[PDB]
Design an enzyme around this catalytic site. Structure first.
Site, PDB file in Angstrom:
ATOM      1  N   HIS A  47      10.525   9.887  -1.174  1.00 28.33           N
ATOM      2  CA  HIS A  47       9.299   9.130  -1.345  1.00 28.33           C
ATOM      3  C   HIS A  47       8.132  10.018  -1.763  1.00 28.33           C
ATOM      4  O   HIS A  47       7.437   9.703  -2.717  1.00 28.33           O
ATOM      5  CB  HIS A  47       8.975   8.399  -0.041  1.00 28.33           C
ATOM      6  CG  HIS A  47       7.750   7.547  -0.104  1.00 28.33           C
ATOM      7  ND1 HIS A  47       6.770   7.586   0.865  1.00 28.33           N
ATOM      8  CD2 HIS A  47       7.354   6.617  -1.005  1.00 28.33           C
ATOM      9  CE1 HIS A  47       5.822   6.718   0.563  1.00 28.33           C
ATOM     10  NE2 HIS A  47       6.152   6.118  -0.570  1.00 28.33           N
ATOM     11  N   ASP A  89       6.994   3.140  -3.242  1.00 27.03           N
ATOM     12  CA  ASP A  89       6.862   2.514  -1.921  1.00 27.03           C
ATOM     13  C   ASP A  89       7.994   1.519  -1.633  1.00 27.03           C
ATOM     14  O   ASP A  89       8.548   1.504  -0.531  1.00 27.03           O
ATOM     15  CB  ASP A  89       5.514   1.809  -1.793  1.00 27.03           C
ATOM     16  CG  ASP A  89       4.347   2.773  -1.667  1.00 27.03           C
ATOM     17  OD1 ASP A  89       4.557   3.986  -1.406  1.00 27.03           O
ATOM     18  OD2 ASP A  89       3.168   2.392  -1.825  1.00 27.03           O
TER      19      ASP A  89
END
Length: 121
Positions: A47, A89
């Site tokens: 991420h 996300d």
């Protein structure tokens, strides 16, 4: 922004993003760097690799448009930079959900616990 990320994490994992992931392992916690402790922690490494390369908008503060529709995340954002933020996300929310089976509360409060040197993105 962290608002959309937090909502996505609740939608996919059923968890509170701040309390369950805000200080987890060597990568999920905010400001945390280091070798992943487990699969959940690896989701967070991926991420950060994903969003830290974006130079034209801010991961923390810039809102984007998405829908939780038919029990899935859809990025509906026009701004190319914000669309990439949304996709970063979305990916971590899915990843955290897929690895809930090995989520370990021992890593939940890991801010003061030592970590190995981080690997490359």
């Amino acid at each position: 922004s962290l608002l959309e990320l937090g909502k996505m994490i609740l939608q996919e994992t059923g968890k509170n993003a701040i309390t369950s992931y805000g200080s987890y392992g060597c990568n999920c916690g905010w400001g945390h760097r280091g070798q992943p402790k487990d699969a959940t922690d690896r989701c967070c490494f991926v991420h950060k690799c994903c969003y830290k390369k974006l130079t034209d908008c801010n991961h923390k503060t810039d809102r984007y448009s998405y829908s939780w529709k038919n029990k899935a995340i859809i990025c509906e954002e026009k701004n190319p930079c914000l669309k990439e933020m949304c996709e970063c996300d979305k990916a971590v929310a899915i990843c955290l959900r897929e690895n809930l089976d090995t989520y370990n509360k021992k890593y939940k409060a890991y801010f003061k616990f030592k970590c190995k040197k981080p690997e490359t993105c």
